[PDB]
Every structure is written in C-alpha cells, then in structure tokens.
Design a protein around this ligand. Structure first.
Ligand SMILES: Nc1nc2c(ncn2[C@@H]2O[C@H](COP(=O)(O)OP(=O)(O)NP(=O)(O)O)[C@@H](O)[C@H]2O)c(=O)[nH]1
Ligand SMILES: [Mg+2]
Lengths: 170, 130
C-alpha cells in the first residue's frame, strides 16, 4: 500500500512541524516558511499490512496557493490544518475545503487538524467550534500539537485507516 | 513498535539542493536592456540529481517571455555547486502589455528535482515604459 497524503492550510499554522513531528518525532522551533513543496516518507502498519505514507507539505503563503493546486491531483488523504490561536486560519478552512472539492479527487479522505493546542493562553478557536465544523462536513477532527507531541501520530493513523477501509471495500 | 530505519534511509537519500536565494527583484527594467541576477545551487544530498524549471499549472513554458534561466536544466553530483542566471530582457512582444499594465514584472519559477521536491523562486520588480 502506498498512500499519497497532502497537508494544506494557511502559512504559519504548523504543517511543516506536524510533518517533522510525525516523521522525525522531534520539534524544531526555528523552521522557515516553505518556499516550494516537499514530501517525506513514513511507513505505518494496519491490519498486518505495511502502508507507505508519502506526505507532501505545501507552501501556505498566498502567492503560491494557485500554483500549489497542481499538486492536489494524486492525493488520497488531505489534512486541513489551522492554528487554534488564529481565528483567520480557521475561517479559511471552508475555503480550503472548496479547493479540495475543485482540484482533488471526489473520494479523497479529509481530516481537520487544529494545531498548536499547547498554546491555550492564546487560543482563539474553541475545540467545540472545530468539532462542529468537522461535523457539518462529515469529516474527522482533532486538536494537535507538533511541539507537545499531542495527537500527531493519532491523526495520521486515523486518516490512513479511513483510506484503507475505503479501498478494501471497493 | 521499533525503529524506522527504512524510512530514515529513504528520506536521507531523497534528492536535495540548497539555494542561495529564492526572491529576486529587478528594479527599473527598461526596453531591450538586459538585467541578470544570479544565484547558486548545491547538491547537498546523497544522490545525483536532475534539476529543471518546469511549466506551472497548464502553462506551455516554464516562465514569461521576458525571462530565462541559464542553465534551465542539468545534472549535479553530490556536493557540486553551479551558478544559475535569471535573465530579464523585454523586447517589443512584451511591451504592449507592460506599458498597458495588464502584465507587470512578476513571475514564479518552479525548479523541479526528478523523483524529488520542487523549489519556488519569486520574481518581482518594475518596468519603466520607454
Ligand atoms: N507552540 C507551538 N508552535 C508551533 C507548533 N507547530 C508549529 N509551531 C510554530 O509555528 C510557526 C510556523 O510553523 P510551520 O510548521 O513552519 O508552519 P507552516 O504551516 O509550515 N507554514 P508555511 O505554509 O509557510 O510553510 C513556527 O514558529 C513553528 O515553530 C506547535 O504545535 N506549538
Ligand atoms: Mg511549511
């Protein structure tokens, strides 16, 4: 099994850190904005099967957003990432979903990640609001923190299980 | 679980370059006057890599007519460094729209590694209608 995954969402929400945490099990606080598009490999196991995840990390800066839609085509699962400390990043999730509907596969698996859940002092988006938006769209949701290692592994395994489940049915 | 040695190896052996610069500003571009801005790339990976500028979205060419990259493709051994020049030359095909204003001195180049990642380079600046 080889699943192509894609991380999208506004600049600064933590996509690169989420990927670094899942692949390197580390956090580096001095990351630069992604000027391009990168991917990393991470293998997991489900139902006694080895699943290779090829995870693409996008540039969230406005000027690259149109260019970046080219890379949605192969995606089997997409993480929609916002920053719990930034209401604008959350508002924009509906716009990211429209992008997925337009440029990705109609049967792509999606998941919403409310990242930086370690910064509750600067929280702008309540967990209930995140949960309700996910519910509205019929997609899974969780809060993550690449810094504190909260739910990152759980998110990715959950997305891959959904993809695998769908594929086995056919 | 146990250590993901296979993943570590496969990631470490993915193509990689270091770019000296990714944002380029061409100030006061004039008609039929050549401007050049250079930057360096190095293969900081473990494997040889083929690089090339590629069209974006559904474009025919990798960049606008007034712009070129030289070289625009090549093959780099690990640890090898090469210079690339970004060349701006506005001829009479580009002026109609640069004087009109329905085109400005802006572009994005996508540098692609075969079987690897892409780097975005941003071009900005201004044209002075001759
Ligand atoms: N406290 C905290 N900070 C985080 C967390 N995740 C990322 N950050 C920080 O938020 C800032 C942006 O992170 P980054 O991963 O680069 O965001 P991005 O979505 O990749 N941005 P871009 O689309 O421009 O590449 C960085 O300072 C990073 O250290 C987190 O879970 N908790
Ligand atoms: Mg990033």
């Amino acid at each position: 099994y080889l699943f192509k995954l894609l991380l999208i969402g506004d600049s600064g929400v933590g996509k690169t850190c989420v990927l670094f945490r899942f692949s390197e099990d580390a956090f580096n606080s001095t990351f630069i904005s992604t000027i391009g598009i990168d991917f990393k490999i991470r293998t997991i196991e489900l139902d006694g099967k080895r699943i290779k995840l090829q995870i693409w990390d996008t540039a969230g800066q406005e000027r690259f957003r149109t260019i970046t839609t080219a890379y949605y085509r192969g995606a089997m699962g997409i993480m929609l990432v916002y920053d719990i400390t930034n209401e604008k990043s959350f508002d924009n999730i509906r716009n990211w979903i429209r992008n997925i509907e337009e440029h990705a596969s109609a049967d792509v698996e999606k998941m919403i990640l409310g990242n930086k859940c370690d910064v509750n002092d600067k929280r702008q988006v309540s967990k209930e609001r995140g949960e309700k938006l996910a519910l509205d769209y019929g997609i899974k949701f969780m809060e993550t923190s690449a810094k504190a290692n909260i739910n990152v592994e759980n998110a990715f395994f959950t997305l891959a299980r959904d993809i695998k489940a769908k594929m086995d049915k056919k | 679980d146990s250590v993901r040695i296979m993943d570590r190896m496969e990631n470490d052996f993915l193509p990689s370059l270091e770019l000296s610069r990714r944002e380029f500003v061409f100030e006061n571009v004039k008609f039929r006057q050549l401007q050049k801005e250079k930057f360096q790339i190095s293969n900081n990976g473990q494997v040889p890599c083929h690089f090339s500028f590629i069209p974006k979205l559904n474009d025919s060419q990798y960049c606008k007519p007034w712009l070129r990259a030289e070289p625009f493709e090549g093959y780099l051994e690990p640890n090898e460094t090469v210079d690339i020049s970004l060349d701006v030359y506005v001829s009479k095909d580009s002026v109609t729209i640069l004087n009109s204003g329905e085109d400005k001195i802006e572009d994005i180049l996508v540098l692609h590694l075969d079987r690897g990642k892409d780097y975005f380079l941003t071009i900005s600046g201004n044209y002075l209608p001759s």
